[model samples]
Target: SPFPLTSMDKAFITVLEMTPVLGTEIINYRDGMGRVLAQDVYAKDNLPPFPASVKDGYAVRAADGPGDRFIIGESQAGEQPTQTVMPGQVMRVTTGAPIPCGADAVVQVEDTELIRESDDGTEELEVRILVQARPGQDIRPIGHDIKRGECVLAKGTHMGPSEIGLLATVGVTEVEVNKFPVVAVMSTGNELLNPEDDLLPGKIRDSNRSTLLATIQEHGYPTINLGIVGDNPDDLLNALNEGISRADVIITSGGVSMGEKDYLKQVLDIDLHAQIHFGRVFMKPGLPTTFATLDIDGVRKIIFALPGNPVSAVVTCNLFVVPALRKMQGILDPRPTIIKARLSCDVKLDPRPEYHRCILTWHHQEPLPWAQSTGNQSRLMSMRSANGLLMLPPKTEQYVELHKGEVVDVMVIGRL
Candidate 1:
């Protein structure tokens, strides 16, 4: 296919295309946080199955208008009162207690005066009603909160705090959700050493694997560290094979560019039998990003081979890999969240549109948030404190630099 008209988000289309949700698994509701529901959760029974009180007061017949009434008994929470309130009588009730038989409404204690009490103030004997009560006043009727057989949560819904409580409210303990993908991450470079290893004359510590792994972890996906595989063809193939067998997605950094020694694409195509979707993107800082897919024994697996540079690796991961992971977890529209922000500093555009690392700030009473660049985009230090990627368009004769106060679309890449 030809290069997209909007070249900035080009990798989004192909990466998301191959990312269908994995499988389904039954997990406890407590473990359902950050999971996507695979089924419609129907309420098993009506909430507040009995007529319950929403406040601490007295349950009385609505027809027993403003007047004195004998106190029959007390109805506390979690206990059903056996003594029913007859005419000219009321029952002291607490919040969440069931309304006794023949009581049509509850009158708040403030609306009534405690005319009498026992010697030790242990019991409410008689009460004077100061206001007339309606039929359903201060009462939560049956099925008020939720009804039986009602769909509380629909399929493909992301489990959240309220959703978790909804499951418990409906008496559902176990919930079915889309399976979260186990991502196997690795770095491929002959000069790369583990972060713990001392850097020799030409050896550089591998920061891409740790950053990528942490990024994946922050998004709640499980990760497998295949460690750093040197630039050997067989070694890369072996590491890739291990990743494909054990994980649903394999992410590798480096060896996708036009370097003569770069052999990741070939290994994936010939040795692993994977389909290469796109080999390059036109965006700055992450042009050589690659996406591929391979199915083993009828099960689909995703592969994202990112650039070798520290900054490019993080940028491409946020742009391509995060959305795919989101889709794999059953997120409906898994594209990265984009918001509008005004540029606080002059930004020079590249020939290709850049995901310029920037910090987003909201000024008091400002119409739009401001975006400031995080030092040089070429350095890994630029990613520090950068919560957004200002989507800058390509440079042209008329518009080479976006001036301050110009509004632009900002792609949120990190926590704000």
Candidate 2:
């Protein structure tokens, strides 16, 4: 219990021991946005059911008009023409209208004019250029956009607005997607009181539960808050058992460190096996984190014992729980893309790896600056630094003396 590790180091080890849980459900397309797919989808029919005109123009048989004059027939979208076209006859066609039989060319409406009616009461139309067009010119053939029986979408793909539009293009109104993983959040500490209630001496408002709830929701999962518990193992075990019954994953902050009254470590040893204790690591903010799993009701559910500090709890969650959730949803590449940026200012590094919270900005011609390093880097400050996490490794000799072009790593906090 006498370790001096940083939070990032603790997160890295906890992630390796988590067991992902599977969840599936059917939802309406409108509700499927941002949810992962459970099954692959195929096209039912061709996108364009027939050869249709692409614009409002005159549909004429390519061989018919050797001269200026041709009889015009009638063809409009959503209506069938009563008469058929013959040689030397053109039809007035609009966009999305079906091209009539015996039509091989489409002349732009701007290029043609409606002449006077003939003495026998027949209307006359003329096209200036007697251009020869092959079959299917200016027309969208059936199955051009999508072919019948072809795969329209694949399983495990996350649905966005553009994906919804693409699915609609293929006539898909509903989908069977994986159900969002349910996260059961709880805080354990007698010194922690509710935010709405007044805090007595030596007590602070419960912050981890609400922060974890919002963090889980922001990541597209539903969270059930189990409230805060005391340092008693029996009470903590009962609350955890109830959470395991209702959620696929359970999260408990506090009562995992070396404090004299901590009970999370004892509860797991007495109630469950297959528990992995990541005996602290070399990261900043949250170094006292642990992860485990229990076969409750024949279902293996993840259990995370995170630090009590507001910044440490969320950082550990992002590092460990997110990857596991993504894996459970069948995502192959389940990690954030790492980006490199130049350090804006000089700063000191801690003995353990530290996650320095800061804002990232870009100006017209000046380099970015990392500001606001004077606040508490606790889990409570994680949300305040929601934009990103600046990484500072352990024991740097030149952090305070680095040049402006020196590079560093940053995780986009809440950017996803």
Candidate 3:
């Protein structure tokens, strides 16, 4: 039988099939930034809870305006007003202070002049209004911002600074949020060496380990470095066992290909009895990628056997690993955001569907985003300034390439 291969879409479906490894945790709102809400949040009480003043002004009856009024008392924030403004009386109020009872409008301090005051001028006794006040002017009514029983934030909402502030406004000091997954990263090869190690004549420095670890940590996930594992099966098995026992997911690079030393897939299937989901993909650079899941001590641990090329490792990480991380943390939309953009230059199509790295740009007059490739995908430097991946479909005998100004879907992977 021919070797089976999984499409990119099918591989992604398998990756997302693994359940969230982390459970919910109740944490202070201050620490909730970048986390996903596990439960829907409701407003405990109305924002402001009562009619409040939006300006430092005099609370007065709108019917009684453009005349001198006796000052009753002051209303400051955090303190309720004890005196009610009557037909010819007003109360001095500060910004954010609750509007006094029986008051219908507020006359700003700039619109009112002090006519009479105590001998020391410590308090105003009378003030003359210059402008006519209208009911509900400059006043924030009860529940103006948020209703008492309305849903403030829904479950699976990613918490940002603005989201956190809204939670605080509705009196949520603590919230239930999904926990992030722990990723165990490892590099497999006899030629890989640590950064500090002296390079031998044939051995190369291990950039994939550092690069992958940094990529995982940059997105806020916890990562454990399993260091470099040689081509020996015993050593690889030991490292894999350690990762399964301690981490939610294990990421290995450099040993999933067809070389004699590429024994990662064999070890997982024959030794660990792991179920391999996909041994290969139809994409460029990362065609040899593999995904597997194993039941370790009753817990299902995911394994990503990524290709060894630096560019391939990085590309697959963004395409597959990031989405898995996002989905595992309760994100409703875990896929990479894709948008339409115009091609700035000619792009050659490959035999298989390709994620061509490019830099998305915008001109002052153009309505659509422009994409320019960062050169060949095999070169690691091509990814240096790439913020998007132009999704180029497989080439057919008739249509082989796209010309400039053609609109193609661009997957935005980073800020431009």
Candidate 4:
């Protein structure tokens, strides 16, 4: 009766509830990478205030190239031409050099040869007019990239490498950016061990605490590591109380599965005015994932109790933690980029919707999903091996294994 979960089980439907909290910070362009700008950035001045040559050539009148050779007066960057081009004359110019006034065309030096010299110390160069000279050729127009007083960088724009370079060129030394939020993470397990300590019989190092710590930080938020809380109810309650007081959100792992040893769910019910939703969804990898929230002192603190398996922990996080973490980081409309891909191998799905761990390889047209790359689909397995979660829906065809080349949903493992 409990195994027949529908697509809703596998589908990560986000609730519309969100806190109206915004973060603001004043930062320079150096550290503003990957952050949305809070205000517009205008150009400080017009780039290249003068017409400049894009190539190393001689600026000349259009008619001077065809049989009429002109004397090379001067040609180099940063030097002004002493002689002006008349009806059948040309002035030598270099790349990035300003175009001399009264020049109608430019003849590349490679297409010309020194032919004669005049008595007045003027040297002439021969040029063939194979190609007709055109106006504005090899010249970068002023303000071509950006204009003055224009909103080059708009508000809510995420700064990337190229954007940073553009801002730097426009003399934007400082910028206004949204601040990252503070997140608190805690672990609940009695048998969890430390990664440094040698494995005593039956002890596993607490992975979720460290995993979530790095994940939260990667999403651009500061983490307050609340350490581990055993199966004791009082300790779990106290940790929750303290974490909610200081952090925007409280995340915990383990102590959520239905077992005689699990006391986290019980303590949460008694200590806080929290509402618990479906404690166990009919999904594979993570059936015991739970979502609950409470309003304490006029602040809404959401809690996601993820399963203890490494794969389940991360998979559950992708479904719930990612969006919530982004919201806490002051992101207004945070969403993941999805791409379609084919399966690399044949794999069967559970009667209910399940999250299968797989490797997604990018081909030219589509992403291919491989099956052998996964170790365990358990919560701990996700912690140890997975970098992505392949969604397996419970369709009639899925009941009988999926073949290679079949399309599936895959969520890349993201941090913070």
Clashes of each: 0, 12, 0, 12
After superposing candidate 2, which stretches have Cα over 4 Å from the reference? Answer: 1-17, 65-74, 80-83, 114-134, 365-385, 396-403
TM-score of 2: 0.85
TM-score rank order: 1, 3, 2, 4
Per-residue alpha-carbon lDDT of candidate 2 for residues 1-416, written as tens digits (9 for 90 to 100): 34334356445545644565376778888887777888898999897877778878778777765445565666878876666667767787889887787777776666666565567765445444345556567788888888999998999788889888878888888888876678899999889998888979998899888888887887787889898888888898899888888988889999878875446777876765546546465667776777777775677788888898888897777767777776666565677655566666666667776775565544467654333342534454344544556767777564544445567777765562
Across residues 236-275, which tens digit of lDDT does each residue of candidate 1 receive? 9999989988899999998877765458888988888998
The candidate scoring highest on TM-score is 1
TM-score of each: 0.95, 0.85, 0.92, 0.79
**Once model 4 is optimally superposed onto the true structure by TM-score, how far is the C-alpha of residue 274 displaced, in angstroms?**
4.3
Return the lDDT, model 2, position 149: 94
Evaluated against the true structure, the overall lDDT of model 3 is: 0.86
Residue 385 lDDT, candidate 4, scale 0-100:
48
Which scores better on lDDT, 2 or 4?
2
State the lDDT of candidate 3 residue by residue for 55-100, as single tens digits.
Answer: 9989999988689999999999999877777899999999899999
Clashing pairs in model 3, backbone N/Cα/C closer than 3 A: none
lDDT of 2 at 133: 58
- lDDT of the candidates, in the order given: 0.87, 0.72, 0.86, 0.69
